[PDB]
């Protein structure tokens, strides 16, 4: 039976490290770090996630505010707010929760965050630098997926990894970290990485996952991954968070079935989710210090 | 037996499209495109490739100058030259031929070229836009590999593709173009892409290539791809240019000629496509589409 990695427990520990680093940063006489999250509209999952981000900020001693705006806001109005916060010396970290309404262009919003306050890693310069293996602010969820693999001791070099999903904020950066060179400014995992997505036929996904030592599913599809596609002893990291039915929450992985064939497994909830919040706190203290 | 895709004949068409577009662009009153190439030192393959580049520019109506500097040049002096060209209103496309001598930070040189003149697609903003599937200058060898696949009509959507190599300038953008979404600003190939590299064991490479509808080799290793790794009928695209003793790619051409459906020769395969797509990017830059 597979070891269930608690993302809740790993995240909680990482927050402690961030907390220690913050009180030391403050005791050295620097300003306490402040994080500003802009929330647009009323997606319920967005409000949970932002709520968890602001709770972790309190836990790690970072000041925070959530600024909620209605979905009917215009792109100029959001840009004005972002520019205002870009210019508030008290604001070290600034993120806009995604997704945004169809009339707001995400990339223009993401690029409008001052790159030094870009705790999301979503600004195009930050994406370029990550894709060139330079020093960069890493996006939280992919960096959380990496920390689960690293802090658990699961090896990546020369190993087979399948990522199901290619979103620019989740699947693509995960795939970029795991396959890239360990020797570069920002090291990578030196793994052999298969990117699959909505046009991968389910029979072809199986033909690759069977080869895999790590399967990372970020597709948003319940039971996408099941025990017959999983090689024995392999690590399965479930990035999906899907609302199904009374209302429940699952990942992409058939947790119970894969449990019996994986060597490692991530639950949903309490897996990759809490790790995203933790790495965001790390990015905020990194941004407050002005290291990049 | 395996169709041998002619790199020279496809680039001929692409180049004719460009001469057409440049002539229309000039006739309607605009300035003729100008491409500046900076070349450092005396790598004989570099001078060959630059010469091929300016030869192709001349036949498609694009003016061009090669600027040669010695290997002993200093990074500060190259930065001067690049900044002067960024501000020369005649220069539409500017590119610095790689590799650069070991004492020069290639990344810092690439980011020095202004992105609107970055016909290589190597400035960090162009790398990021490409990785976001946005309108960008695509790098010439990656775009050439794509054009070979599209214009030969080899399907990619839903197909297994392996790329051997992860270099930021060739292997990585090939993998990016091929796995990405056909419906985005810059479309991709919607394939299932495996990225292999130097720490991939051969057994695991072969276990992934026997599944591959398209194998793309950009590793710079002679005889890497052999017929036992290739499934019957699959397309094999040889990006590597290896000076063995002669000039050959990564593939075992004669052997894989028997198992593959399609194959590309070295030379005369991807090589000419790189020169062809650089011509596309130069007319794109002159139009200031971005
Ligand atoms: N911290 C966390 O755990 C966290 C945070 C955010 C999102 N998520 C989840 O992780 C994923 C992130 O992706 P997103 O929501 O940004 O992307 P998205 O919703 O825009 O697209 C999802 C991706 O799934 C892929 N996909 C769809 N069907 C597939 C199939 N049959 N096989 C393989 N791939 C398939 C798509 O091609 C696409 O790349 C989603 O599943 C989301 O629920 C998790
Ligand atoms: N330099 C040029 O002008 C030019 C032009 C077109 C094509 N190419 C070819 O493309 C290659 C890549 O371009 P570059 O020079 O920027 O890259 P590079 O020389 O930095 O490295 C090439 C790649 O090969 C990979 N590799 C090494 N051993 C491997 C193995 N056993 N299996 C799979 N992959 C392996 C490496 O991990 C690396 O990513 C070149 O070596 C060259 O032959 C070069
Ligand atoms: N700008 C921007 N926009 C974005 N969208 C993201 N991504 C993001 O925020 N992801 C995210 C996902 C899950 C969770 C979390 O807290 N997970 C808990 C369950 C809690 C719960 N509450 N209700 N249901 N579940 C769990 O998985 O156990 C926190 C954050 C970003 O990073 N930056
Ligand atoms: N900034 C920058 N720097 C770079 N280094 C590159 N890469 C690059 O230019 N690659 C490249 C490789 C081959 C050829 C070519 O012409 N191949 C022919 C001739 C064979 C031959 N050789 N000698 N005799 N015959 C063939 O393969 O058929 C053209 C370009 C770049 O794109 N931008």
Numbering used by the authors:
A (entry chain A): 36 to 280, 286 to 332
B (entry chain B): 36 to 280, 288 to 332
The authors write:
Methylenetetrahydrofolate dehydrogenase/cyclohydrolase 2 (MTHFD2) is a bifunctional metabolic enzyme found in mitochondria, exhibiting both dehydrogenase and cyclohydrolase catalytic activities. In one-carbon metabolism, MTHFD2 converts 5, 10-methylene tetrahydrofolate (5,10-CH2-THF) to 10-formyl tetrahydrofolate (10-CHO-THF) in mitochondria, thereby regulating the production of NADH, purines, and pyrimidines. An isozyme, methylenetetrahydrofolate dehydrogenase, cyclohydrolase and formyltetrahydrofolate synthetase 1 (MTHFD1), performs similar catalytic reactions to MTHFD2, albeit localized in the cytoplasm rather than the mitochondrion. The key distinction between these two proteins lie in their expression profiles: MTHFD1 is typically expressed in normal cells while MTHFD2 is abundantly expressed in immortal, embryonic, and cancer cells, but absent in adult normal cells.
Bioisosteric replacement of γ-carboxylic acid of glutamic acid with 1H-tetrazole to give 16a significantly increased the potency against MTHFD1 (IC50 = 120 nM) and MTHFD2 (IC50 = 22 nM). The structure of MTHFD2/16a revealed the headgroup, 2,5,6-triamino-3H-pyrimidin-4-one ring of 16a, establishes a hydrogen bond network with key amino acid residues, including Val131, Leu133, and Asp155. The urea moiety of 16a formed hydrogen bonds with the side chain of Lys88 and Gln132. In the middle region of 16a, the phenyl ring formed robust π–π interactions with Tyr84, and hydrophobic interactions with neighboring amino acids such as Tyr84, Ile276, Thr316, and Val317. The amide moiety adjacent to the phenyl ring was hydrogen bonded with Asn87 and participated in hydrophobic interactions with Gly313. Furthermore, the carboxylic acid moiety of 16a not only formed a hydrogen bond with the main chain of Gly310 but also established a well-organized hydrogen bond network with Gly311, Val312, and Gly313 mediated by a water molecule. Moreover, the 1H-tetrazole moiety formed hydrogen bonds with the side chain of Ser83. Superimposition of the structures of MTHFD2/16a with MTHFD2/LY374571 revealed that the 1H-tetrazole moiety in 16a exhibits an enhanced tendency for forming hydrogen bonds, either directly or through water bridging, with the side chain of Arg278 and Ser83. Moreover, the larger size of 1H-tetrazole moiety was found to form more extensive van der Waals contacts with neighboring residues such as Ile276, Leu289, and Pro309, as compared to its γ-carboxylic acid counterpart. The collective impact of these interactions contributes to the increased potency of 16a and 16g against MTHFD2.
